[PDB]
């Protein structure tokens, strides 16, 4: 086995790389993390040249642009041109090098905004999403237009998994262009410095439901491995286990021991107030796959974050 693991130095890269590393490798794969710097792959002959150079038969995919819920908002044509640039190399450069699986990413927000909850797999293109995250939104979308294609045409084995909001190690603290739980970290670690108040975005009601990148990294290794499936598949935490942002960022200030004020900047968006997504497909093939408890977990990224 030769697995080809692309835009390995971010949050879930980083994650599948110490899960790996603390053992998990089973003997016979060879295991290549890569970033741009190894190849720009929206440039067609640099990842062409990589798929190449690097022959797999396996492949997770996971070079992308990701950004929070302010970042989309702002540069939607950029989500959409950047991402369907990245997809459509990755996953045709995969097909004539005849790779065996690829294993793709997608996400909970790519849902239709107007839809019956909870969502499943089947539900991912009955209505068009959120007009905030539109663009990176339908460039996740195509990835299964493109995994349904290849496997009805050529009888490839493209799948997709799609993962809630990750949080964790080796994560964009960047508060401006970051998602909820570490833009939250750091802005409360900046209110300890500076003396300074939380101050939360938003009204602290859109509900959320967070998986742990380490949890998610045991998963996706398990997906590579073992689900057979084009249709994608949820990997998230329980429907009873969604909560609000009021809720993550008292997590993030119990972790951290702020006892400062927090306030709530009510005149920022919300973005998707929910988006509660059903493990069932999950918990037919994992019944006992154990989550890590989301306070310990939100811990451990806090402490992390003060120590690196
Ligand atoms: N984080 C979440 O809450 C969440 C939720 C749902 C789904 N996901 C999925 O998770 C996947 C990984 O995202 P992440 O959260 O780990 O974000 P991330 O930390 O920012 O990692 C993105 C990775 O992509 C690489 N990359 C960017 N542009 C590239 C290019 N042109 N060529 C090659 N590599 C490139 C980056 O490398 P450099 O640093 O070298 O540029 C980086 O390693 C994405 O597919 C995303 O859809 C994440
Ligand atoms: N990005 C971000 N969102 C925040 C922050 N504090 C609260 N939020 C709330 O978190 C939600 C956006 O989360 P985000 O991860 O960026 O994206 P989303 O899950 O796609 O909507 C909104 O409901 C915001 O009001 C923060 O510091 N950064």
């Given at each position: ?100 699986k690829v294993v793709s990413?997608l ?13 499943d797999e089947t539900?991912i ?19 299964d237009?493109?995994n349904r294609?290849?496997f009805?045409?050529?009888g490839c084995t493209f799948t997709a998994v799609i ?59 398990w997906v590579l491995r073992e689900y057979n499936e084009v249709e994608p598949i949820i990997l ?44 069932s497909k999950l918990?037919t093939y994992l ?22």
């Open positions: 086995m030769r697995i080809l693991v692309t835009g390995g130095s971010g949050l879930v890269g980083k994650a599948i790389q110490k899960v790996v590393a603390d053992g998990a490798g089973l003997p016979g794969e060879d295991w290549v993390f890569v970033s741009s710097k190894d190849a720009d792959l929206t440039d067609t002959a640099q990842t062409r040249a990589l798929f190449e150079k690097v022959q797999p038969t396996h492949v997770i995919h996971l070079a992308a642009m990701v950004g929070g819920l302010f970042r989309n908002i702002k540069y939607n044509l950029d989500f959409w041109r950047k991402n369907v640039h990245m997809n459509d190399n990755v996953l045709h450069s995969a097909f004539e090098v005849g790779a065996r990413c996400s909970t927000c790519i849902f239709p905004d107007k839809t019956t909850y909870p969502i539900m293109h009955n209505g068009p999403p959120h007009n905030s995250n539109f663009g990176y939104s339908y460039a996740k979308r195509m990835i237009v493109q294609a290849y009805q045409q050529y993962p809630t909001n990750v949080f964790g190690p080796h994560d964009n603290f960047n508060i401006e262009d970051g998602h909820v739980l570490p833009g939250l970290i750091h802005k409360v670690h900046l209110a300890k410095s500076s003396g300074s108040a939380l101050t939360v975005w938003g009204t602290g009601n859109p509900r959320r439901q967070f998986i742990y990148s380490l949890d998610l990294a045991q998963l996706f290794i998230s935490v329980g429907e009873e286990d969604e909560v609000s942002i009021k809720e993550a960022a008292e997590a993030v200030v119990e972790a951290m021991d702020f006892h400062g004020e927090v306030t709530f900047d009510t005149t920022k968006s919300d973005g998707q107030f929910k988006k509660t997504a059903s493990n918990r019944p006992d796959f154990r989550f890590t408890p989301f306070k310990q977990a939100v811990k451990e990224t806090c402490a992390w974050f003060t120590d690196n």
